[PDB]
Design a protein around this ligand. Structure first.
Ligand SMILES: Nc1nc2c(ncn2[C@@H]2O[C@H](COP(=O)(O)O[C@H]3[C@@H](O)[C@H](n4ccc(=O)[nH]c4=O)O[C@@H]3CO)[C@H]3CC(O)(O)C[C@H]32)c(=O)[nH]1
Ligand SMILES: [Cl-]
Length: 395
């Protein structure tokens, strides 16, 4: 019987059920969440969590918006920082510390991100960092060191693409990939409080990617995840979420490597984009449902729950105590990629937490990146149209 079938039987028997709406569509994240939930439900006497898949993360925020309109929300949901900003406009969210959930020991990179006007409104749960995935065999074949700097990274992509007769740096033409180049060229999305999409660092970042396509070293991936396209043509590198770690390991026919990101200089690794979500608790939930949320949140923050979840997926453990847990230690001792993910999590940047950001990153910024990369639009002209559309949406 599948974990989701066991959870269904657990919730059928329970006297109180707290729904948790999520955006895991499958693979290791979905299985690891469901395993965490079965264990929690087993320790409870008739008090359970029911995880409800709502599609992807965009389907989830659409589903929560419908629930506001219908007047019926879940007890808990996954949320990005911008989704939290949006839900706070409706005063929909319970402050976490009012449930008595202790947050001492949560990574300040993650706790700062859920604090709005000095109050914590989410529990960091599944937090990812971008890493450098690479083909150990193909770098070794051609004598190419893992690149430590953006300059070395471009040099390595060109050398390997020439040797293998195909573009070896694979990328999705999206806001997440753009953020890695933008941040490590000195970019900042906010200037004196204003959102800017068309700064010289943005044009520099999109131009670097478009020039890589033209020069034959950068391969756009338009159908499926990078790890779902492996095996078609030579691959050397991608910049991708740590939460894809198990998918990469299972797909790659070559010796997979994980490195810290290339940076401006060898003095420090590149900054990676933080992705994944926080759990929020809705005010409209009953006192009995809120008590279940309190216990589930303390369970999710326990060193063992974090150790198992993070080693199953590639997410970054959110607590100091997770790294001191023997099950984490056992995994890290056999596989250095876990410590690599933690070290990269020290060099970590967030996108803006504006309530409108989800629409901007996909429909405005992501469309401009696709215009430049897939339809040969001039980078500055594509980003000037994005700036115009963002300015119109934020007024
Ligand atoms: N709605 C909304 N989405 C946002 C926001 N900021 C960023 N993102 C998206 O976060 C995804 C990263 O979140 P993460 O939890 O790190 O990783 C995801 C999956 O990526 C990853 N996965 C799954 C299958 C696979 O073959 N490979 C794989 O890597 O597993 C996890 C569960 O789906 C990016 C992907 C995106 O949808 O294209 C746009 C990005 C936001 O503000 N809102
Ligand atoms: Cl850096």
């Amino acid at each position: 019987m599948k974990p989701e079938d066991v959870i269904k039987e657990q919730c059928a028997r329970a006297k109180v059920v707290a729904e948790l709406w999520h955006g895991f569509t499958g693979g290791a994240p979905k299985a690891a969440l469901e395993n965490l939930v079965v264990e929690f439900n087993k320790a409870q006497q008739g008090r359970c969590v029911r995880p409800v898949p709502q599609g992807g993360y965009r389907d989830l925020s659409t589903k929560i918006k419908a629930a506001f309109a219908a007047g019926k929300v879940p007890t808990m949901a996954q949320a990005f920082e911008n989704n939290i900003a949006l839900y706070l406009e409706a005063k929909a969210l319970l402050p976490i510390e009012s449930l008595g959930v202790k947050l001492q020991g949560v990574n300040l990179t993650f706790l700062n991100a859920v604090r709005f006007g000095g109050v914590v409104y989410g529990v960091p749960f599944n937090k990812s960092i971008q890493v450098l995935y690479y083909n150990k065999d193909l770098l070794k074949k051609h004598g190419v060191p893992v690149p430590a700097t953006l300059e070395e990274f471009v040099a390595a992509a060109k050398k390997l693409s020439r040797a293998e007769g195909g573009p070896v740096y694979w990328f999705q033409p999206d806001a997440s990939t753009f953020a890695y180049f933008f941040f490590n060229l000195g970019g900042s999305y906010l200037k004196d409080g204003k959102l800017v999409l068309n700064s010289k660092e943005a044009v520099e970042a999109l131009t670097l990617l478009q020039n890589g396509v033209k020069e034959g070293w950068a391969k756009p991936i338009t159908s499926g995840a990078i790890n779902q396209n492996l095996g078609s043509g030579p691959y050397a590198f991608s910049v991708d979420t740590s939460a894809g770690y198990t998918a990469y390991l299972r797909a790659a026919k070559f010796d997979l490597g994980v490195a810290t990101l290339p940076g401006r200089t060898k003095g420090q690794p590149g900054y990676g984009l933080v992705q994944g979500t926080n759990l929020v608790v809705f005010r409209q939930a009953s006192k009995e449902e809120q008590a279940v949320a309190k216990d589930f949140l303390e369970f999710v923050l326990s060193p063992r729950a974090q150790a198992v979840f993070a080693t199953a997926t590639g997410y970054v453990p959110v607590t100091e105590g997770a790294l001191k847990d023997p099950v984490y230690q056992a995994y890290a001792a056999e596989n250095p990629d876990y410590a690599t993910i933690v070290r990269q999590s020290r060099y970590a940047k967030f996108e803006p937490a504006l309530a409108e950001w989800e629409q901007i990153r996909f429909d405005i910024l992501g469309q401009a990146i696709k215009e430049a990369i897939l339809n040969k639009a001039d980078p500055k002209a594509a980003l000037d149209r994005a700036q115009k559309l963002a300015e119109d949406l934020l007024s």
